[PDB]
Amino acid sequence: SAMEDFVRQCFNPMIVELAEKAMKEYGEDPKIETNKFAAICTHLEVCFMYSDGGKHRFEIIEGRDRIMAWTVVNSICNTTGVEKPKFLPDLYDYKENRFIEIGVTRREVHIYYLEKANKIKSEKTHIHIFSFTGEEMATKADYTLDEESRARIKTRLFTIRQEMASRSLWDSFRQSERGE
Ligand SMILES: NC(=O)c1[nH]c(Br)cc(=O)c1O
Ligand SMILES: [Mn+2]
Ligand SMILES: [Mn+2]
């Protein structure tokens, strides 16, 4: 339908393939769970732009299969002594030496921040929440990146929102929590 066409049009093939493998990991059909499909693509794209903004400052953990994700996490923990996370995070920051969980939400950033912080329940994993409204919220108000990079992420998310809006897809997507 329209959501599947949109996702194939605004995301590059690499992200779309990773998103479809996420959907088979979950057991869900991208033709049917189209909001979750789009949310997964959007979150992948943000994680990849975040680590590109970073001499490579960030290690990408999201988007790897689980074997390779835990391999990377364990290697980081073995060479830094940073405490192992209970859930797979999204990136590792080699400058601040901490794991990062990235959240992308259609709700208020502080609501989703509280939800993430309550879930992962580790003071050491840094949380950074982005909305589709240019808002952000991060552990200790430490936004990690400089203003330019955060601006580029915010711009991309708002653009995705407006592209769905032009296709009459935004109302469905925002009223859904699927993919968060
Ligand atoms: N499986 C994950 O790693 C994951 N899942 C959801 Br739902 C939202 C996230 O931000 C995230 O990193
Ligand atoms: Mn993740
Ligand atoms: Mn995340």
Residue numbers in the entry: -1 to 52, 73 to 198
The study reports:
Among the most important influenza virus targets is the RNA-dependent RNA polymerase acidic N-terminal (PAN) endonuclease, which is a critical component of the viral replication machinery. In native PAN, the Mn2+ cations are coordinated by His41, Glu80, Asp108, Glu 119, and Ile120 and five water molecules, producing an octahedral coordination geometry at each metal center.
Compounds 1, 2, 3, and 5 present the same triad and display similar binding poses, coordinating Mn1 through the ketone and Mn2 through the carboxylate, with the hydroxyl group bridging Mn1 and Mn2.21 The binding and inhibitory activity (vide infra) of these compounds are comparable to those of the parent MBP 1. Interestingly, several nitrogen-containing isosteres were found to have a bridging water molecule between the nitrogen of the hydroxypyridinone core and a nitrogen from the isosteric groups (see compounds 3, 4, 5, and 9). Despite conversion from a potentially anionic carboxylate to a neutral carboxamide, compound 3 showed little difference in activity when compared with compounds 1 or 2. Comparing both the rotated and planar structures of compound 8 to those of compound 3 (0.357 Å, 46.669°) and the ligand-free structure (bound water, 0.685 Å, 44.571°), both conformations of compound 8 exhibit poorer octahedral character. While compound 8 does bind favorably, it demonstrates higher distortion parameters than compound 3, possibly accounting for the decreased activity of 8 compared to 3.
